[model samples]
Target: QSIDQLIKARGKVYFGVATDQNRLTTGKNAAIIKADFGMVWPEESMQWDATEPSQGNFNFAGADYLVNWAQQNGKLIGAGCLVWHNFLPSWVSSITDKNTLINVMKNHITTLMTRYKGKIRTWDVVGEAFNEDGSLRQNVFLNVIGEDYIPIAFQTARAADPNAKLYIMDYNLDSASYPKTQAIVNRVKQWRAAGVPIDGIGSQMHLSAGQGAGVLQALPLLASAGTPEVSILMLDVAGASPTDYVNVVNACLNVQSCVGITVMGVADPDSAFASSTPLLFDGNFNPKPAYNAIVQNLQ
Candidate 1:
């Protein structure tokens, strides 16, 4: 059985992977993804540059292809960031007016969420919004729209997609050494207390060695930190054994609140962290040591 099938048989937890329109159309990568995973995240196509390269002039072709395929093939969709600091249009930085920036952000969230609505099961409403010290990142959104933009983005998304699960996605949430993790936890708590529609936290576990399983321990804390779900959105091991990869998976499986775990890529070459081979499949889509390791522990 596939990893998805195996995990579902074991519990309510499921496996997912980040993919793009190219891989979906390509035979080898797509085949492995479909067979092994239960959900798909549009790695880049759903980003600001890909979907709306220019203000008001939106292009959803690439993202559309993935959405359509997911629907046709019966795969659950995990739509990435509606608001992120990187990959933004050049024109965004030039906007001097706060109201104008807020309107633009609201429009982007509203349009995209309205378009996908029930089709997308979950959304990374805001991504990487904090500095390592826990201060908000000084992005164009913060410069103009201010810190209120975080809650604004989440509220806007909730308004657009009432049925969808909304999340605040960030990196380093796993590391106790990273103050940003607790900062994020505190922020989520504040949002929930304030009646924001934030539903979960996406801990992007783009871990390197020496980070240890400290992040795994943070999972339950984050889940109870006010959000109903705590998903390990990006999980990959660098300079570690296949046993390390298995340990990460087991950590997620062991956490009742961690509803899902997504390996960042299907294979090495396709990976954003290509040097690390941070997934279950190798460059040629063959199962790696991590694959069997996962299967061996699924029970």
Candidate 2:
């Protein structure tokens, strides 16, 4: 049976894998995604530059393909970065006026979310917004709109898809040594304090072989430190053993608020982190040991 089947049987929300237009519509990957996964999260094709390439020129063809495929297969969706620093267009990058940037930013969110609305459920309203040193990362949004850009993005997303789970995704936030985790947690607290509607905190659990322990340590932090519902948003375990997969899944299983886990890619060879072969399957659609481990443990 699919790992997603086992995971949902155990009461977790979904077992998702990240994909794009090129990845999902293809042959072998498409079969695997349809049969084995319960949800789909877009890696690209849903971002700023891809969705809105020029000023006000919106293209939904690529993203719409994935969304339709998911719905056809009865899969759930966790969609875009309506507010990210990268994959943004030159128009957004060249903004000198704050209000212009703000209008453009909010317009993008409103337009994109409005397009799909209820079809795409979860959204990464913001992504990689902080540096490892516990400070907001430098991006056009920060440079032009300042830190308030976060609230603007979230609030706009809330207005656009009032029912969607608005997630803020980041990498390296699980590391206890860095204050990055604290910074994100602090933002959650402020959102709570301000009564701004927020839904999920997603840890992009990108890791090497031995990083599962860090995830085990981090999920509790992501859960309790004003842990507004959490998830393992974009995960890949390069150079990982079966035990590494077990530990990561176990961490999510133990965390009461972690709704889902989205593996970074479908197969190792196609994985962005393919250097260490970090997915559940090999290029030939053969299930790896990590897949077996994840399946056995999800029970």
Candidate 3:
């Protein structure tokens, strides 16, 4: 093993694999799963249109399989889709009022939590609620519930799973100190003051290698807004450029405050170019360079 590998292992290691219901071929997706990070944010699972398109209906078969698979593997599960505009069922998208939407989200969170209770570790309670400048993302939920939903969501999640860690995940370039970032911090503060249980803030560092360092630097500023702990659950996300990993590794090493880093099999999985890496093994099942990067770091 290399010296860099040793240094990272000593740090809070959070290597991750991102999965969804559609791509989970024969649960072969789960078969390929490894590492400290096992992220499941189902586009179909979270989006009501895809989940239960009709009223009074719920479908979690696909999602449940993925979540249970992660838990059985002894992985640290990071669950998303607590609140996302895209995940809202298409039927409800145009017609539902804010109160109704918030109700749906609340029910979804409660039900999902009840199933995975104490199994998954962290949750991205509120995702991408603001523009890079900190303004609201102008979703129907925000338009109806207003920004108050932030505190309500976090506090409710605490009540749902008192033991699980809570996170606010976003990708705004100025998320550290932008207005929405401040709103998130302030809302978290209000909840904390009222004794809400929030554990950490998630900076979804989907930047070039050096960009993450700036995010780390901004963490101190975010501290003023009252987030108690901060971690980079998924960082250094890139493809087609092998040397880019070196920069990400170096940047994470230099940032004393960055608690963890996870480079997923599908780097920027949501991006159109997500196919560049082709991370899984072939028929013989041998590891790739990226896979070796992780194994080398761990061993």
Residue-pair clashes per candidate, as listed?
A: 1, 0, 4
Candidate 2 yields a Cα-based lDDT of 0.85
Q: Which order, best to worst by TM-score?
A: 2, 1, 3
Candidates ranked, most accurate by lDDT first: 2, 1, 3
Candidate 1 yields a Cα-based lDDT of: 0.82
Provide the overall lDDT of each model, using Cα atoms, as 2-decimal numbers.
Answer: 0.82, 0.85, 0.57
**Stretches of model 1 off by over 4 angstroms after superposition:** 210-212
Candidate 3 C-alpha error for residue 69, in Å: 1.3
Error of model 1, residue 275, in angstroms: 2.5
Native-structure RMSD, model 2: 1.2
Output the number of the lDDT-best candidate.
Answer: 2
Candidate 3 clashing pairs, residues 3+ apart or interchain:
47-87, 49-89, 134-179, 134-180
> How many Å off is the CA of 32 in candidate 1?
0.8
Q: Which parts of model 2 have CA positions greater than 4 angstroms off?
A: none
TM-score of each: 0.95, 0.97, 0.75
